[PDB]
């Protein structure tokens, strides 16, 4: 009854040195780290990640902002795809609810700290793009009996 | 002009070792600790606590999950019965607002960390069930002039 | 593309010793401290600060509550006037959204920790009232490239 | 291989509203809450608590400062009697090591936030003074396999 | 029985946006903010501040690093001159004790976040240099009875 | 003038869900994340990691405790090998200084949350064991001018 979502800390999260705070927010709910890797995003991989936006006039500047260190992550939990989006908040930080990552940390959409999958189909596509199968780890949280009903 | 409400940290709050964090959230608003007791909740007392659910099909499992260590608490403040419910958030953590206890810590309704009274009537009944009158402590917060208008 | 707002920690924020926590919430979004000054507010400056309420029955007691230590602040950021208001929350803490300053720290409107300008015109007026131009400091945040689009 | 120690938050800890923060420090090490009770300490019980200081010139003032709300606590862990003393720090906050409770929160010995048992013998005596045996709760922490070797 | 010390957040503390965290550490002990002002340090004022080091070969680069925004502060407390130095930790962060500001935040002496007076004579000299008399505020903390013995 | 050290969060750090808190402690000093990978440690790689203990009676049980999820990390900074060891604290949590990871989170050596390289030679060896060169990411922190001399 759990699912997995792809979450990626963008270069502003790395450079503002809030990686640990971001991870703690997801651990706090008992979400399980199933995969985690630091890499440097490149244009070719970002073009695939943002394939839906191919040709749009904002894409080159988006790719420029995203070319940098990122933390690739997979978290597992109940309804975690939708819940992670809720926790990140609106794309535009000024519209995001107090208590969300983007409202608490950010000002503008082009520097909004973190990416998360928007659907089950996107999560599968994004996890496959950024991770190899060996990098997804299967284990059980010891506090499961107190996290899940 | 203040009220008192009954708040109970459920066994998942004890076992996940977030008792202090929960207490701090209520202290942060200048709510006063009027009573506090660790006990182990048993089926007979839980039957009385959940008396409104007598006969319902979910009550046996509810009593099972709640059989365990709990922290019984009474907090005092302006409108604290309704306000503590707002702070806990929706019964379902997935529906609760970011910034609430259940949204920040939990995933499912059956493991949602904390109980709080839903009304003046329930608060009076619940305080009387879990505490003797001699366990309720009266004192004044030194910062009262800066908390209350 | 940034603006500046006037934020003032009221005597209750000073006395409850949460100045640092308040400042940290604005720093966390990459808002820039452009001015900061501890002073003891006088009725004379408070009458002008609250000029919009001249002749109202609540004004004498309001000035009385505010005659004490305050931290005058100017913060700079994108949309910071409206955003700081959002972060403070509703005037009445009980109506404010979880995750806002007033909801997280306070109980009643008369002791709601902080003031922030309510509009661009009010911000200009309030900054000029509490600060001389030579007290407003211009510098660039080193993380600007990761905060702004 | 575990021990139990008596820890008491003194009236300054209650009044400064740092109870949760104190509890969190002990929970953070995987120490188990075995008992917890808010009460108001009275001279007669404090006379027994401080029996070793019978007849000393400072005892009357010590009893006066301690007359007030307190949080009685029992924590269980490996070597927890000595370890809780290390965590509290020196009696004089000005001599206590950074990172200890008294160094982080306090200024003077007479307002040093917290009491903890100084030995196995004192722990047994103090637990018996402030708690009846039926108030001491036995349960196992779900994360025991990752806390204890 | 209290004294006052001059503490100054250096430009790295401003630019790393840890001002609020620094202030919170001193508020946590019940130290009173007696003065606070943001300014931009200039070579002429820094030459007076660092007058003891006139002519030394490191001074020009020190002044270069310190030319930037700073937060001037006066904190009041028992033994606060010595205690603030202890809380900052060793000049060289690698030698500073865990739990001190410099150990927790910094790497090298040339970027060690904060300055504090080394003596009563230095505190008077530094407070006079960076503050006007009007900027030092006299008021009493409401929690005094629980901070001071 | 910086170096790199190998830091590994052990299965207890994963299961107690304090990964974010651990990372934040190193980020707080301006240490740079150069590599990061979640994996499940195998006896084969653990035998090599712990090669210095081949033939000792504790090694089988050590490998057993460590066969589980781990977060492999490389952090970069001035003197970071020795400094990270200082931040971890003594092997035995009860001997570790307050404010260190082991003293703040742990009770016993066999469950002490984290591993760090003990020397420059061990760091080079351990980085090479757990990471391929292509996994080590080179980038500059935008705050470098405020972190380094
Ligand atoms: N599965 C499950 N559902 C619950 C539990 N507690 C409440 N619910 C359900 O959650 C819904 C939302 O709760 P409400 O927001 O109405 O208090 C209710 O209609 C109830 O059926 C629980 O412990 N487990
Ligand atoms: N349907 C359903 N409702 C529940 C369950 N547990 C609790 N509830 C509802 O949620 C309310 C809040 O639960 P409490 O926090 O008091 O345990 C209860 O008073 C009851 O109305 C459950 O297992 N199933
Ligand atoms: N009715 C009423 N409104 C107030 C009072 N204090 C503040 N307000 C309202 O809230 C706004 C915020 O002003 P602040 O007091 O936060 O600087 C005021 O401009 C006014 O509209 C009060 O005592 N009574
Ligand atoms: N003024 C004052 N001194 C105290 C208090 N408690 C302990 N002391 C003193 O502080 C010294 C240091 O305490 P120790 O570190 O020996 O436990 C003792 O010799 C004792 O005289 C207190 O509440 N007030
Ligand atoms: N001289 C002195 N010692 C004190 C005073 N209060 C406490 N102490 C000492 O400090 C120890 C720890 O104090 P507690 O935390 O138990 O109140 C006491 O057992 C006693 O030895 C005081 O007012 N004066
Ligand atoms: N005697 C003993 N020493 C150990 C044990 N585990 C770790 N150590 C020591 O502590 C060091 C840290 O290794 P770690 O286990 O933290 O990766 C080891 O290289 C070894 O010196 C153990 O089970 N027994
Ligand atoms: Mg306002
Ligand atoms: Mg090690």
Integer Rg of chain C from CA:
15
Nearest to F26, CA basis, from F106, F66, F81, F67: F81
Which chains share 3+ C-beta pairs under 8 angstroms with E?
Answer: B, C, D, F
Helix (H) or strand (E) holding C100: none
CB A46 within 8 A of CB A105: no
Residue C35 CA, ligand 3 centroid: distance in Å:
23
CATH code assigned at F16:
3.30.70.141
Beta-bridge mates of residue E108: none
Token pair of C26 as six digits = 């604005």
Helix pair F19-27, F80-88: axis angle to 10 deg? 130
Do residue A146 and residue B110 have CB atoms under 8 angstroms apart? no
* Length of chain E (residues): 149
Residue at F128 is within a domain: yes
Resolution of the experimental structure, in angstroms: 1.6
B97 in a structural domain: yes
Bridge partners (DSSP) listed for residue B76: B4, B32
Residues with Cβ within 8 Å of D68's Cβ and at least 6 positions away in sequence, in order, are: B139, D10, D11, D14, D15, D40, D41
Instruction: Identify residues after which chain E is interrupted (C–N over 2.5 A).
Output: none
Does residue B91 lie in a domain region? yes
Q: Is the dihedral of CA B21, B26, B29, B35 positive or negative?
A: negative
Whole-angstrom Cα distance, residue C70 to residue C25?
Answer: 18
Taking only Cα atoms into account, the Rg of chain D, rounded to an integer number of angstroms, comes to 15
In a domain, D112, yes or no: yes
Instruction: Give the whole-angstrom CA distance, residue A34 versus residue F38.
Output: 8
DSSP secondary structure letter of residue D90: -
Could you tell me which of B67, B71, B115, B68 has the C-alpha nearest to residue B91?
B115
Phi–psi pair at E138, nearest 5 degrees: -105, 120
Q: ∠E14-E74-C5 over CA atoms, to 5°?
A: 45
CB-facing half-sphere around the CA of B46: CA atoms within 13 A: 21
Distance of CA A142 to the CA centre of its chain: 24
Is C65 inside a domain boundary?
yes
Size of chain D, expressed as the number of residues it contains: 149
Task: Catalogue the E-assigned strands of D42-106.
Answer: 68-78
Helices and strands in chain B: count of H runs, count of E runs: 8, 4
C55 CB-near residues (< 8 Å, 6+ apart): none
List the strands of the sheet with B2-9, edge to edge: B114-116, B2-9, B68-78, B32-41, D32-41, D68-78, D2-9, D114-116
Q: Determine if ligand 5 sits within 6 Å of the CB of residue D91.
A: yes
Distance CA B144, CA D77 (A): 37
Contacts of F124 (CB under 8 A, 6+ apart): none
B115 an active-site residue?
yes
Q: What is the C-alpha radius of gyration for chain F, rounded to an integer number of angstroms?
A: 15
How far, in Å, CA of D130 to CA of C38, rounded? Answer: 45
Residue with CA closest to ligand 6 atom 17: F115
Q: Of the candidates C34, C58, C33, which has an alpha carbon nearest to the alpha carbon of residue C46?
A: C58
DSSP label at residue B124: H
For chain B, list the strands marked E by DSSP: 2-9, 32-41, 68-78, 114-116
Task: With respect to residue A120, please indicate whether it lies within any of the assigned structural domains.
Answer: yes
Reference E77, options E14, E3, E129; nearest CA is: E3
Contact partners, residue F99, CB within 8 Å, separation at least 6: D97, D98, D99, E97, E98, E99, E103, E104
Position of tokens 């909004």? A112
Exposed, middle or buried, E122 (CB in 10 Å: 0-12/13-18/19+)? middle
D97 in Cβ contact with F97 (< 8 Å): yes
Query: Looking at the 3D structure of chain A, how many domains does it have?
Result: 1
CA B17 to chain centre: 16
Q: Chain B partners of D15 at a C-beta cutoff of 8 Å?
A: 141-143
User: Where would I find the H helices in chain C?
Assistant: 11-15, 19-27, 43-49, 59-66, 80-88, 101-105, 120-130, 144-147
The half-sphere exposure of A35 on its side-chain side, counting CA atoms within 13 A, is 20
CB within 8 Å of E12: residues ≥ 6 apart: E65, E106, E111, E112, E113, F146, F147
Give the Cα separation of A101 and A29 in Å (integer). Answer: 14
Please, are residues B147 and B141 in contact by the beta-carbon 8 Å criterion? yes
Cα–Cα distance between F17 and A32 in angstroms, integer? 8
Distance of CA D79 to the CA centre of its chain: 15
Q: Ligand 7 centroid vs C109 CA: distance in angstroms?
A: 10
Angle at B31 between CA B30 and CA B35, to 5 degrees: 140
Tokens of D36: 């917890």
> Ligand 2 pocket check: which of B95, B105, B109, B130 to mutate, most ligand atoms within 8 Å of Cβ?
B109
Q: Are A51 and A89 in contact (CB under 8 A)?
A: no
Residue E58 CA, ligand 1 centroid: distance in Å = 67
Residues in chain C, total: 149
Three-state DSSP at F74 gives strand
Instruction: Give the burial class of B87: count Cβ atoms within 10 A of its Cβ; 0-12 exposed, 13-18 middle, 19 or more buried.
Output: buried
Is residue E149 in some structural domain?
A: no
Question: How far is the CA of B82 from the CAs of B72, B88, B120, B146, in angstroms?
Answer: 18, 10, 9, 22
- Are D97 and F97 inside 8 Å of each other by CB? yes
Taken in order E83, E89, E95, E101, the sign of the CA dihedral is positive
A144 falls within a domain: no
- Report CA Rg, chain B: 15
Domain encompassing residue B96: 2-135
Q: What is the per-residue burial (b if ≥16 Cβ within 10 Å, else e) of A62-89?
A: bbebbebbbbbbbbbbbbbbbbbbbbbb
Closest residue by Cα to residue E20 from C33, A106, F23, C85: C33
Those residues with Cβ within 8 angstroms of residue A30's Cβ, 6 or more apart along the chain or in another chain: A77, A141, A143, A147, B16, B105, B106, B107, F17
Angle subtended by helix axes C80-88 and C19-27, to nearest 10: 130
Q: Whole-angstrom Cα distance, residue B55 to residue B77?
A: 34
The H or E element that residue E105 is part of is helix E101-105
Query: Which 3 state secondary structure label does DSSP give E64?
Result: helix
Residue A132, burial from CB neighbour count under 10 angstroms (0-12, 13-18, 19+): exposed
In the DSSP assignment, the letter for residue E107 is S
Beta bridge partners of residue A7, listed in sequence order: A73, A116
* Both structure tokens of C70: 């305050």
């Amino acid at each position: 009854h759990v699912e997995q979502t792809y979450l990626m800390i963008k270069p502003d999260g790395i450079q503002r040195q809030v990686v640990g705070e971001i991870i703690s927010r997801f651990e706090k709910r008992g979400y399980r780290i199933a995969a985690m890797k630091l890499t440097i995003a490149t244009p070719a991989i970002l073009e695939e990640h943002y394939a839906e936006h191919k040709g749009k006039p904002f894409l080159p500047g988006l790719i420029e902002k995203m070319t940098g260190p990122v933390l690739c992550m997979v978290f597992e939990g109940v309804d975690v795809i939708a819940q992670a989006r809720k926790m990140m908040g609106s794309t535009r930080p000024g519209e995001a609810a107090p208590g969300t990552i983007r409202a608490d940390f950010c000002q503008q959409a082009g520097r909004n700290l973190i990416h998360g999958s928007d659907s089950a189909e996107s999560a599968k596509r994004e996890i496959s793009l950024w991770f190899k199968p060996e990098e997804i780890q299967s284990y059980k949280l010891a506090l499961s009996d107190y996290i899940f009903e």
